Nucleic acid binder design. Sequence first.
RNA 1: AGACCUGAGUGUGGCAGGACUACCCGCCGAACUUAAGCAUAUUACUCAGCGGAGGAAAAGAAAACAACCGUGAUUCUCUCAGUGAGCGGCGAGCGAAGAGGGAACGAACUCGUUGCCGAAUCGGGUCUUACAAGGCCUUAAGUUGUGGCACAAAUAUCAU
RNA 2: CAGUGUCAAGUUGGCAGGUAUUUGUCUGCCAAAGUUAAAUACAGAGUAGGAAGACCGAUAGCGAACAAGUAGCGUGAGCGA
RNA 3: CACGAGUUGUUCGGAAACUGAGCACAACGUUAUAUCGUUUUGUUAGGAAAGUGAAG
RNA 4: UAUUACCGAAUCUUUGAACGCAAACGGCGCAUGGGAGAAGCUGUGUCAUCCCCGUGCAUGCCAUAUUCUCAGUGUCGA
Lengths: 50, 123, 159, 53, 51, 110, 118, 203
Amino acid sequence: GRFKPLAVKKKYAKKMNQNKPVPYWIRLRTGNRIKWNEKRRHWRRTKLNY
Amino acid sequence: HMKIKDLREKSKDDLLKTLTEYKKELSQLRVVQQTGGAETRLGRIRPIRKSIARILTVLNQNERSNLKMFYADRKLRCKTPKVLRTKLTHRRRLALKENEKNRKTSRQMRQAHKFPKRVYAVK
Amino acid sequence: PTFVTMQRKKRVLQRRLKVPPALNQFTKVLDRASRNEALKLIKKYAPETRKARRERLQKVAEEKKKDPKKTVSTKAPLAVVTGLQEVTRAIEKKQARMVVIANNVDPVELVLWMPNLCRANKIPYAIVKDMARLGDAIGRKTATCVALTDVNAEDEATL
Amino acid sequence: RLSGMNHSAHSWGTGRAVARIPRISGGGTSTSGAGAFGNMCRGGRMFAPTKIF
Amino acid sequence: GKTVLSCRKGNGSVYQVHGHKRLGPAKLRILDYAERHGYMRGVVKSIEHEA
Amino acid sequence: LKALRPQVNCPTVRHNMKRRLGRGFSPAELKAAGLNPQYAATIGIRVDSRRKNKSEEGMNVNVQRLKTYMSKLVLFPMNHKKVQKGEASEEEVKAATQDRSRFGDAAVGA
Amino acid sequence: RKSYTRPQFRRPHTYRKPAMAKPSNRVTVESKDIAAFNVIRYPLTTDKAMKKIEENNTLTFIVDSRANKTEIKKAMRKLYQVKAVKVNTLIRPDGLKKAYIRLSAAHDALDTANKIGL
Amino acid sequence: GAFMYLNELWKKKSSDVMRFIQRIRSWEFRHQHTVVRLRRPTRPEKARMLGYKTKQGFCVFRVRVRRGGRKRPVHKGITYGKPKTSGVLGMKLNKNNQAVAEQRLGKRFGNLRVLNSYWVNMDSTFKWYEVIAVDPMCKTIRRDPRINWIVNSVHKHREQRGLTSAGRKHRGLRHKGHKASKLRPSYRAAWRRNNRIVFLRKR
RNA sequence: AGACCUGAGUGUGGCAGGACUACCCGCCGAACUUAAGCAUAUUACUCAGCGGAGGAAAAGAAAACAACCGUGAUUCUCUCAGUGAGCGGCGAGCGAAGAGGGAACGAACUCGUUGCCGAAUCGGGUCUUACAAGGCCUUAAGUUGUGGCACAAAUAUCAU
RNA sequence: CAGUGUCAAGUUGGCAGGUAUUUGUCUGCCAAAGUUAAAUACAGAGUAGGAAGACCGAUAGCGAACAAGUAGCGUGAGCGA
RNA sequence: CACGAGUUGUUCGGAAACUGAGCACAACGUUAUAUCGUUUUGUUAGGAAAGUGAAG
RNA sequence: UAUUACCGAAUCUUUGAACGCAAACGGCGCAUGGGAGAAGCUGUGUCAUCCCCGUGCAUGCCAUAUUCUCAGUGUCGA
Ligand SMILES: [Mg+2]
Ligand SMILES: [Mg+2]
Ligand SMILES: [Mg+2]
Ligand SMILES: [Mg+2]
Ligand SMILES: [Mg+2]
Ligand SMILES: [Mg+2]
Ligand SMILES: [Mg+2]
Ligand SMILES: [Mg+2]
Ligand SMILES: [Mg+2]
Ligand SMILES: [Mg+2]
Ligand SMILES: [Mg+2]
Ligand SMILES: [Mg+2]
Ligand SMILES: [Mg+2]
Ligand SMILES: [Mg+2]
Ligand SMILES: [Mg+2]
Ligand SMILES: [Mg+2]
Ligand SMILES: [Mg+2]
Ligand SMILES: [Mg+2]
Ligand code: NA
């Protein structure tokens, strides 16, 4: 609901900023192994519980 | 791109003026970063940031050297701020110095003088 | 405060209990007039101070500088003997003409045996009221005991 | 000396239709409930481990 | 065995006095100099009940 | 490399007939050889003040060891300028060598 | 110290010497003419921000999230020669602080935006 | 000198006058705190024997400890396992009360180094010791060749590691030769020496 | 009036509490197991628990061995020795020391006490290129004793 | 060795000489204060460097040759590809 | 699933600023061991826990 | 050199033994230096309330006071 402390809000904001796909040019680098993020999180699959 | 040999000759007032000019430049480039912008313009951000770093480096080195020379006087030596002393380690700061060690009693000194260690050889 | 209460109750307890003679003898002190007279004598034979010792030694040094020969006579002026170790030595070697002991030394075992030693060696002695008064006479804060071994020709009758 | 034994594994006992070998605890991974500690288990300890003496 | 209830009550726990609505303890006044040598006069102000 | 040590007898009735090196020379042996113990400590001689001499022959052996050693010592001068009393000249300092034997018995023998 | 009129002894009042100001333990050179650049980071050019410039005389900025309204007003006065009559702030779900700033109608927010370059 | 008289007098703790003096002191001690700082030692001759000097960096404290046997701290006095380990009230601590007093002082005041201690008084409930400590940051201590060994960090918590005189006493290090062979240089060192299995390369 | 003793408040200069913990030092301390049962015994003066250091720690300079033609601080190694020692429901089991060959080794010193001196000592200012193991000044500490000299490896105190 | 009770002697003395006591001899040593390098440990430590192996070879070898104490699980202590 | 956006306060809720069932820092005591106990029945601690207006 | 390697000069957000007081609060103080500052006072200055920044401020213990201020039916003394 409405209430949360600011520190909790900032932790949730960092997770929101992290939840993104790999930019395409990263796959073109010499000797690259990254294909997908593999740390993607969906709100309805795994809980953070902050 | 400010040059370090050029910065080392300036005074404090001039260095601060340069700092203000470069901060204003970087601030103006942030607006371009927001509103589209050309790649040549965006290429200027890194050199300006590094110039700001250089100016602050020169300022701080000069200030610390001046304060160390100022507190080097014997009267003020006991009141040097802790951030301007030598660091070493906690243990080494607390340990006995060479002068405090090696102290000996009158009898020990006299006996060392009366029977010194010799150099000899056996035929 | 607790320390006030305890330092009063200690005096009361020392009064109410049965006190053996070796400790009881320290409550029987010399009178006022003789106490004042003895303290005056000790005051006039007080030991020399730091400045006086320095000045005398410097004058002896200049005398020796001008005369590389000749004796120097670094004996220091006649005075009273002060300090527990030196006073005990004077009592035991029977050099002391008279011994004065303070009656309130804590711990009391420091001087508890001194009247017995003086009686054994037949040395005149007295027990007087304050180690602070003895210390004032000799120029310090406190003295436990003082011994007179010799005086000038003018004070023989007083002694 | 520790290889193959770094688990808090316990046997499930009889009365379930599984072999009585000790099994990994917990959940949420593909290793949970797997066989453990035995010389015949994947990830187990070898028979008569070698020594420097 | 297990602990008997009469022994358990000595730990305190959920068996202590329900005192939140009570007024203070009930006592006479202090035996002071006025009570030892003369007398004191008070006035009854209220009569009440406590749980 | 190793300091000079005395010869002693082994104890008990099983090792009575053997000999070995002890800890240090006794002050009685050192006095019979004419040596201040404190000075002997500085020219590579071991000193042991605990050991007693209960017989003459055991003392004589060690006095002879000390004398043989002292006859072969080559003492270097403190100051190269001035040589005082029994100290080596510069020829011996030139022809000085090191005894690296396992027991330090080169010039007294086993 | 002569006659006490209370049933318990309390501590007496004695002379207290004030403490001395030591030489500062921080000797880093900090310029006082560049703080406004830390306070005000850059403007925003979204649709809502553009709509506010013309019809409400308002500008939208990203600011340092530890700054307050009074210092945002002073920074506006320093950086641009404009007077703000109202500052409203919010902290966005991505963690940055945003400010809606209304000018005093003696200045044109559109002309200030043109000078800024947005 | 006077040391002989003081030492001989303190060898007569059961005489009438000594009993009176000790009774007064015991009464006053038992109305003070568990740890008390003193200006001067109560027994100067003993303190100087044990290493105290009337110098700037030396300090003396008096510590109180409680008498009697150790009680095993088990819930409701209930033990488990073999009957050999079932005593509650009849076992004794393997450390002595002097070492306990030193350890309490040293744990309380971490800026000091404990040197030694001695017995001062006794009573039916309590025993009292005096503990000598030095300041390792005092210039007088640091420049004095007879004492500045204690500045080195290998001497930080001697009393906690059992290196003082009382600790040596309960470690058994007063004895040598055939009376102490199984505890030298320590019990654990001797046990390791006698129990480790040895594998020579060719065997 | 003041002084000493015992306690406080504040200013000035410092130090402790945390981490790490393989090895090392001090406490506290099991049971499974073995005995074809089990309670003494064993596992074990071990695991778990609490505390404390270092580059190693601890030990160390004879209130030591022996009973010899005598050795000579400590630590470590081989051996003594799974012992014709010894402990043990004398069962299961347990269990060392002296001597001998070696590694290391410039290995030794300091207080207190006794005798002779008795502030000669310490801190703090200040000046010498110097918070000098130096001068000068200091009541501040200290005589309820700081410091010097001699004492078994010694021959004696001073005296330039 | 620890707790409590009891509590010395004066180098004509004291302690040790592996069966208790009393009495004479003999031998070694001098407790109840302190400092001290090396030879020894590192049986789940660490810093800066080095050298190897009749070892394992991707279900093996450290749990981990990969963004591995990660993803994921548990209220939690913890568990863990 | 991808890209781009959105949460505006002198007065609304909280805090600043109450007290309750309760908690437990200091102090003191205990323990080989603080990682233990006491701490609102007007109330800490053998307990010297007050640092101020006003005058001048 | 936006190249690499090494190192002596520097920078080093919020915390944490965490130590001004607290804390599911990016909170609230006391001293002492600064900054900005419409209002008012005089376009300069100057500036109340409000706002911002630096430094010090835990407990215990040791030493110390150009010899700081005290307390006691403790012991004396004028
Ligand atoms: Mg929620
Ligand atoms: Mg494996
Ligand atoms: Mg109640
Ligand atoms: Mg051995
Ligand atoms: Mg610690
Ligand atoms: Mg087993
Ligand atoms: Mg069976
Ligand atoms: Mg055993
Ligand atoms: Mg353990
Ligand atoms: Mg050591
Ligand atoms: Mg002396
Ligand atoms: Mg030692
Ligand atoms: Mg694998
Ligand atoms: Mg989505
Ligand atoms: Mg808002
Ligand atoms: Mg309440
Ligand atoms: Mg309260
Ligand atoms: Mg805090
Ligand atoms: Na069995």
